[PDB]
Write a protein that binds this ligand. Structure first.
Ligand SMILES: CCc1cc2c(cc1OS(N)(=O)=O)CC[C@@H]1[C@@H]2CC[C@]2(C)[C@@H](OS(N)(=O)=O)CC[C@@H]12
Ligand SMILES: [Zn+2]
Ligand SMILES: [Zn+2]
Length: 257
């Protein structure tokens, strides 16, 4: 089964998922000097006030905080998008060291981690149908750097020991994702794909310019999670990120000067 090891990592994915070598794969390196400022781009609209988290799960790749997407309780709109996109879940990608971990890079710089808030286009009814569409998903990417602690992330960090291994899950209600956002919503945007199999090219990527800072203690608790399932040889869950892919015939647009 695909993973992030020497024998089943990103380099091996194309065998079971040919689209890994497609025309609009993600992540990609964001060259801030070649990114085009587009004055017609609109401010991003993040409406997370009625968000309803349900639980946190360790899927063997990363951990997911899921939300109730049966109503327009937490949506992303505006920016480069048309219509409404419902938040279904958020997860992270981190490294074994602070110098690596993010999937997207900025002028080749890699951050310690990357938060992905996944939303699907409401015009497609459900997430399953959305992924089969070129504009079915909108993933808000937010870089994480190590420094001061992020208060809004502590509730997440403290429950990880309860889902240490693959398959484990636990209730996780009333978590507010607004505590995970940086001050500015300035962003870069480009058409891409899921960064893990099935690697479907259904994503409008929106990557925030301003990263959030987390403490070394917080990211350390991320690295204590396991890739393996309970009762198996321990393999720490680290470096679950896919490297940058060829931009090909795409242009990264910036919402700010
Ligand atoms: C709905 C299609 C589908 C998608 C996804 C999975 C299983 C799926 O079902 S399948 N292919 O096994 O029948 C498992 C891994 C999922 C992926 C959708 C995109 C996800 C949330 C990724 O988000 S990301 N990095 O922002 O692109 C992380 C894990 C990914
Ligand atoms: Zn899996
Ligand atoms: Zn992701």
């Amino acid at each position: 089964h695909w993973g992030y090891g020497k024998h089943n990592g990103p380099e091996h994915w194309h065998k079971d998922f040919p689209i890994a070598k497609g025309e609009r794969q993600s992540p990609v390196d964001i060259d801030t000097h070649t990114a085009k400022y587009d004055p017609s781009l609109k401010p991003l609209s993040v409406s997370y006030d009625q968000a309803t988290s349900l639980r946190i799960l360790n899927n063997g790749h990363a951990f997911n905080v899921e939300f109730d997407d049966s109503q327009d309780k937490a949506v992303l709109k505006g920016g480069p998008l048309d219509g409404t996109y419902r938040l279904i879940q958020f997860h992270f990608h981190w490294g074994s060291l602070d110098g690596q971990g993010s999937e997207h890079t900025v002028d080749k710089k890699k951050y310690a981690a990357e938060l992905h808030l996944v939303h699907w286009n409401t015009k497609y009814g459900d997430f399953g149908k959305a992924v089969q569409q070129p504009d079915g998903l909108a993933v808000l990417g937010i870089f994480l750097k190590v420094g001061s602690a992020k208060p809004g992330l502590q509730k997440v960090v403290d429950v990880l020991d309860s889902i240490k291994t693959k398959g484990k899950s636990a209730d996780f209600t009333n978590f507010d994702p607004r505590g995970l956002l940086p001050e500015s919503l300035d962003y870069w945007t480009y058409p891409g794909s899921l960064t893990t199999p099935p690697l479907l090219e259904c994503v409008t990527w929106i990557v925030l310019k301003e990263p959030i800072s987390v403490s070394s203690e917080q990211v350390l608790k991320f690295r204590k999670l396991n890739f393996n399932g309970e009762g198996e040889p321990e393999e720490l869950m680290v470096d679950n990120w896919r490297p940058a892919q060829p931009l090909k015939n795409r242009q990264i647009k910036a919402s700010f000067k």
